[PDB]
């Protein structure tokens, strides 16, 4: 395939999606250990933005080589944040659910 | 600040190297907290490090 | 219905200073951004700054920074503006406006949508 | 200072119908979507009726409209009534943290 090389920690983005319906897959259900891997048949829309608008000042360290750090703030600071859609996702989940007790 | 909960950017300054020499200049940036941890082994909250 | 009250008049000499007042009520005070407007005799206007009620960080045209002190007093629902170093061109009507809603999430404070006033106060350098 | 070009005044009668404009940069009014409208007379602070390019305020006129293009804002009237005679003015966002203001106008009526 075209692999994307894309990195996160609890949810895996913008990956190719499940083959026809939702699939748990793990070395050893059974094991608590073993981190199971969940594939999903629709896609969740995430999105993500930072409102604070930055900017960045050169400062030299040295003969030849800059740095680069965030130097004032022009707008007004507010909070990072994302934003999910409650009922995709709620659906989502409880369909994971029933997959889930497929083995259990 | 008073009120309210946002980040913030904890100012701070520093002596480095100038552009030309090894003369000595006052700079300053803003740097996220997790970035920043304090220093002091002395109960002082002015003296700060990288996290590096 | 939602209404701001403001300063009488005032006088006073180049070099001098002058604050102005602007006590608001009718709505939650502190949720919404507070907008300053000059209004010289006759001519265009001339907007001034902004300020979060419930932060400091207030902002102001080039023409007035450094020259310009901005707070307001959560006690009394009171905006005060301060003007530091007076001119025969600062002779104007000044007034405060209130601005849009202080989201916690997307920033609407440069945004044009001010939709109460105060009386305007005049100010005359002599 | 203020890039916000606007003419100086106009003048009609009843049931005709005049469009005021002013000129922006590409900076500002060609770059956001952030451009009202007031009105003042003497006597009184101004009045908005146009918000956020075309929206309107509570109650007041629904008779006015605007639409903006390119780096010109307009403001559009119709039918023209007495109670229109005011000193108009331009107003944008202007980029970083700054709201501007144009040179204002007078609509001479009725």
């Known amino acids: 395939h075209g692999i994307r090389p894309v990195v996160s920690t609890q949810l895996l983005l913008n990956g190719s999606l499940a083959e026809k319906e939702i699939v748990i897959r793990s070395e050893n259900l059974t094991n608590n250990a073993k981190i199971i891997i969940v594939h999903l048949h629709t896609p969740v829309e995430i999105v993500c933005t930072r409102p604070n608008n930055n900017t960045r000042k050169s400062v030299r360290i040295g003969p030849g080589q800059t740095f680069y750090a965030t130097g004032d703030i022009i707008g007004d600071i507010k909070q990072a944040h994302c934003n999910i859609s409650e009922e995709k996702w709620n659906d989502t989940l409880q369909k994971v659910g029933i997959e889930l007790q497929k083995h259990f | 600040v008073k009120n309210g909960t946002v980040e913030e950017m904890k100012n701070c300054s520093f002596n480095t190297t100038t552009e030309i020499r090894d003369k000595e200049k006052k700079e300053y940036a803003l740097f996220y907290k997790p970035d920043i941890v304090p220093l002091s082994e002395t109960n002082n909250t002015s003296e700060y490090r990288l996290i590096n | 219905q939602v209404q701001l009250v403001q300063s009488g008049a005032e006088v006073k000499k180049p070099g001098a200073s002058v604050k102005v007042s602007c006590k608001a009520s009718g709505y939650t005070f502190t949720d919404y951004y507070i907008h300053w407007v000059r209004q010289a005799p006759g001519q265009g206007l001339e907007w001034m700054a902004w300020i979060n009620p419930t932060t400091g960080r207030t902002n102001s045209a080039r023409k007035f920074q450094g020259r310009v002190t901005m707070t307001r007093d959560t006690s009394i629902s009171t905006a005060y503006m301060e003007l530091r170093r007076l001119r025969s061109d600062d002779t104007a009507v000044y007034y405060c406006?209130?601005?849009?809603?202080?989201?916690?999430?997307?920033?609407?404070?440069?945004?044009?949508?001010?939709?109460?006033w105060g009386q305007g106060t005049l100010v005359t350098v002599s | 200072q203020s890039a916000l070009t606007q003419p100086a005044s106009v003048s009609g009668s009843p049931g005709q119908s005049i469009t005021i404009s002013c000129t922006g940069t590409?900076?500002?009014?060609?770059?956001?979507?952030?451009v009202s409208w007031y009105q003042q007379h003497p006597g009184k602070a101004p009045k908005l009726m146009i918000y956020?390019?075309?929206k309107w305020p509570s109650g007041v006129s629904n008779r006015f409209s605007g639409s903006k293009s390119g780096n010109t804002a307009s403001l559009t009237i119709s039918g023209l009534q007495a109670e229109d005679e005011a000193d108009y003015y331009c107003?944008?966002?202007?980029?970083?943290?700054?709201?501007?203001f144009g040179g204002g106008t007078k609509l001479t009526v009725l």
């Open positions: 956020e390019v075309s």
């Open positions: 406006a209130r601005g849009g809603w202080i989201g916690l999430y997307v920033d609407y404070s440069g945004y044009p949508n001010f939709d109460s």
């Open positions: 107003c944008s966002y202007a980029g970083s943290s700054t709201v501007i």
């Open positions: 590409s900076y500002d009014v060609g770059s956001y979507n952030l």
